[PDB]
Amino acid sequence: ASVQIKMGTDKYAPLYEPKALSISAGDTVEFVMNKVGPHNVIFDKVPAGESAPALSNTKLAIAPGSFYSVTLGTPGTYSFYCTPHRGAGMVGTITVE
Ligand SMILES: [Cu+]
């Protein structure tokens, strides 16, 4: 019910938090940059229904703030990852029940 994806932990660790997120069909998933940037929103891939390889955005924004929000509907588990933080181990997931 209205969640947000924070990029980076207070431990100056560039990782997606919460690593995992769950929502309902029709909920929204926001995304804000905690720290250790820059960041971005590049999904990994989603099952039939949505378009993971579309909602993505490699428009890494250095400016720290709340990137943006997006609503979903297609049920299933969505994955993603950071562009600059791909090796740092900054990956997360989302669920739309
Ligand atoms: Cu990142």
PDB file of C-alpha atoms and ligand atoms in Angstrom:
ATOM      1  CA  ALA A   1       0.000   0.000   0.000  1.00  0.00           C
ATOM      2  CA  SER A   2       2.137   2.817  -1.350  1.00  0.00           C
ATOM      3  CA  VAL A   3       5.763   1.840  -0.870  1.00  0.00           C
ATOM      4  CA  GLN A   4       9.115   3.338  -1.790  1.00  0.00           C
ATOM      5  CA  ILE A   5      12.466   1.965  -2.891  1.00  0.00           C
ATOM      6  CA  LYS A   6      15.360   3.618  -1.096  1.00  0.00           C
ATOM      7  CA  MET A   7      18.698   3.406  -2.867  1.00  0.00           C
ATOM      8  CA  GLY A   8      21.526   3.173  -0.363  1.00  0.00           C
ATOM      9  CA  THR A   9      21.743   2.477   3.352  1.00  0.00           C
ATOM     10  CA  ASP A  10      22.812   4.655   6.256  1.00  0.00           C
ATOM     11  CA  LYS A  11      25.858   2.409   6.252  1.00  0.00           C
ATOM     12  CA  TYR A  12      27.150   4.249   3.208  1.00  0.00           C
ATOM     13  CA  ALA A  13      26.354   0.973   1.488  1.00  0.00           C
ATOM     14  CA  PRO A  14      24.902   1.289  -2.021  1.00  0.00           C
ATOM     15  CA  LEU A  15      22.103  -1.256  -1.958  1.00  0.00           C
ATOM     16  CA  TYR A  16      18.383  -1.420  -2.642  1.00  0.00           C
ATOM     17  CA  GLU A  17      16.150  -1.146   0.402  1.00  0.00           C
ATOM     18  CA  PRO A  18      14.063  -2.738   1.249  1.00  0.00           C
ATOM     19  CA  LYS A  19      15.892  -5.481  -0.610  1.00  0.00           C
ATOM     20  CA  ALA A  20      12.421  -6.917  -1.073  1.00  0.00           C
ATOM     21  CA  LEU A  21       9.078  -5.164  -1.354  1.00  0.00           C
ATOM     22  CA  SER A  22       5.520  -6.428  -1.628  1.00  0.00           C
ATOM     23  CA  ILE A  23       2.343  -4.668  -2.693  1.00  0.00           C
ATOM     24  CA  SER A  24      -1.090  -5.267  -4.170  1.00  0.00           C
ATOM     25  CA  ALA A  25      -2.386  -5.102  -7.721  1.00  0.00           C
ATOM     26  CA  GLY A  26      -2.826  -1.378  -8.239  1.00  0.00           C
ATOM     27  CA  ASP A  27      -0.382  -0.187  -5.606  1.00  0.00           C
ATOM     28  CA  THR A  28       2.510   2.171  -6.237  1.00  0.00           C
ATOM     29  CA  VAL A  29       6.251   1.841  -5.765  1.00  0.00           C
ATOM     30  CA  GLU A  30       8.207   5.033  -5.205  1.00  0.00           C
ATOM     31  CA  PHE A  31      11.963   5.396  -5.477  1.00  0.00           C
ATOM     32  CA  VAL A  32      14.208   7.775  -3.571  1.00  0.00           C
ATOM     33  CA  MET A  33      17.978   8.079  -3.457  1.00  0.00           C
ATOM     34  CA  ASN A  34      19.331   7.565   0.040  1.00  0.00           C
ATOM     35  CA  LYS A  35      23.036   8.000  -0.597  1.00  0.00           C
ATOM     36  CA  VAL A  36      26.055   6.575  -2.379  1.00  0.00           C
ATOM     37  CA  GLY A  37      25.060   7.738  -5.841  1.00  0.00           C
ATOM     38  CA  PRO A  38      24.501   8.204  -8.501  1.00  0.00           C
ATOM     39  CA  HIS A  39      21.558   5.847  -8.831  1.00  0.00           C
ATOM     40  CA  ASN A  40      18.872   4.872 -11.312  1.00  0.00           C
ATOM     41  CA  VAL A  41      15.956   2.550 -11.971  1.00  0.00           C
ATOM     42  CA  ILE A  42      16.762  -0.292 -14.336  1.00  0.00           C
ATOM     43  CA  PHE A  43      14.576  -3.344 -13.844  1.00  0.00           C
ATOM     44  CA  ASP A  44      15.944  -6.814 -14.482  1.00  0.00           C
ATOM     45  CA  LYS A  45      12.874  -8.426 -15.995  1.00  0.00           C
ATOM     46  CA  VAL A  46       9.266  -9.228 -15.174  1.00  0.00           C
ATOM     47  CA  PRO A  47       6.865 -12.029 -16.124  1.00  0.00           C
ATOM     48  CA  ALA A  48       4.164 -11.668 -18.752  1.00  0.00           C
ATOM     49  CA  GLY A  49       1.885  -8.799 -17.809  1.00  0.00           C
ATOM     50  CA  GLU A  50       4.111  -5.773 -17.335  1.00  0.00           C
ATOM     51  CA  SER A  51       7.072  -4.355 -19.218  1.00  0.00           C
ATOM     52  CA  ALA A  52      10.117  -4.392 -16.969  1.00  0.00           C
ATOM     53  CA  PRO A  53      12.368  -3.694 -19.964  1.00  0.00           C
ATOM     54  CA  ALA A  54      10.492  -0.458 -20.545  1.00  0.00           C
ATOM     55  CA  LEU A  55       9.716   1.186 -17.226  1.00  0.00           C
ATOM     56  CA  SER A  56      13.452   1.114 -16.623  1.00  0.00           C
ATOM     57  CA  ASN A  57      15.399   4.356 -16.767  1.00  0.00           C
ATOM     58  CA  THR A  58      19.142   4.630 -17.268  1.00  0.00           C
ATOM     59  CA  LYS A  59      18.857   8.364 -16.712  1.00  0.00           C
ATOM     60  CA  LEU A  60      21.058   8.155 -13.640  1.00  0.00           C
ATOM     61  CA  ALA A  61      20.442  11.304 -11.633  1.00  0.00           C
ATOM     62  CA  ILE A  62      23.270  12.564  -9.456  1.00  0.00           C
ATOM     63  CA  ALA A  63      21.008  15.092  -7.777  1.00  0.00           C
ATOM     64  CA  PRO A  64      19.901  13.464  -4.514  1.00  0.00           C
ATOM     65  CA  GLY A  65      16.149  13.300  -4.048  1.00  0.00           C
ATOM     66  CA  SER A  66      13.003  11.327  -4.781  1.00  0.00           C
ATOM     67  CA  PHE A  67      13.405  10.127  -8.347  1.00  0.00           C
ATOM     68  CA  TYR A  68       9.748   9.377  -8.979  1.00  0.00           C
ATOM     69  CA  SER A  69       6.857   7.008  -8.384  1.00  0.00           C
ATOM     70  CA  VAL A  70       5.089   4.497 -10.597  1.00  0.00           C
ATOM     71  CA  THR A  71       1.925   2.458 -10.208  1.00  0.00           C
ATOM     72  CA  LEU A  72       1.645  -1.198 -11.151  1.00  0.00           C
ATOM     73  CA  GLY A  73      -1.146  -3.710 -11.631  1.00  0.00           C
ATOM     74  CA  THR A  74       0.226  -6.874 -13.192  1.00  0.00           C
ATOM     75  CA  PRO A  75       0.564  -9.516 -10.468  1.00  0.00           C
ATOM     76  CA  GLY A  76       3.928 -11.180  -9.978  1.00  0.00           C
ATOM     77  CA  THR A  77       7.435 -10.568  -8.696  1.00  0.00           C
ATOM     78  CA  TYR A  78       9.478  -7.797 -10.270  1.00  0.00           C
ATOM     79  CA  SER A  79      13.250  -7.544 -10.086  1.00  0.00           C
ATOM     80  CA  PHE A  80      15.714  -4.749 -10.754  1.00  0.00           C
ATOM     81  CA  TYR A  81      19.244  -3.482 -10.246  1.00  0.00           C
ATOM     82  CA  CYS A  82      21.429  -0.393 -10.180  1.00  0.00           C
ATOM     83  CA  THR A  83      23.399   0.624 -13.249  1.00  0.00           C
ATOM     84  CA  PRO A  84      26.423   2.115 -11.475  1.00  0.00           C
ATOM     85  CA  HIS A  85      25.966  -0.203  -8.518  1.00  0.00           C
ATOM     86  CA  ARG A  86      25.711  -3.516 -10.329  1.00  0.00           C
ATOM     87  CA  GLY A  87      28.779  -5.102  -8.779  1.00  0.00           C
ATOM     88  CA  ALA A  88      28.410  -3.430  -5.403  1.00  0.00           C
ATOM     89  CA  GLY A  89      25.526  -5.844  -4.971  1.00  0.00           C
ATOM     90  CA  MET A  90      22.623  -3.424  -5.181  1.00  0.00           C
ATOM     91  CA  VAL A  91      19.650  -5.455  -6.348  1.00  0.00           C
ATOM     92  CA  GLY A  92      16.074  -5.620  -5.119  1.00  0.00           C
ATOM     93  CA  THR A  93      12.650  -7.019  -5.923  1.00  0.00           C
ATOM     94  CA  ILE A  94       8.992  -6.056  -5.861  1.00  0.00           C
ATOM     95  CA  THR A  95       5.752  -7.979  -5.504  1.00  0.00           C
ATOM     96  CA  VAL A  96       2.267  -7.102  -6.694  1.00  0.00           C
ATOM     97  CA  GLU A  97      -0.245  -9.363  -4.990  1.00  0.00           C
TER      98      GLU A  97
HETATM   99 CU    CU B   1      22.744   2.671  -6.559  1.00  0.00          CU
END
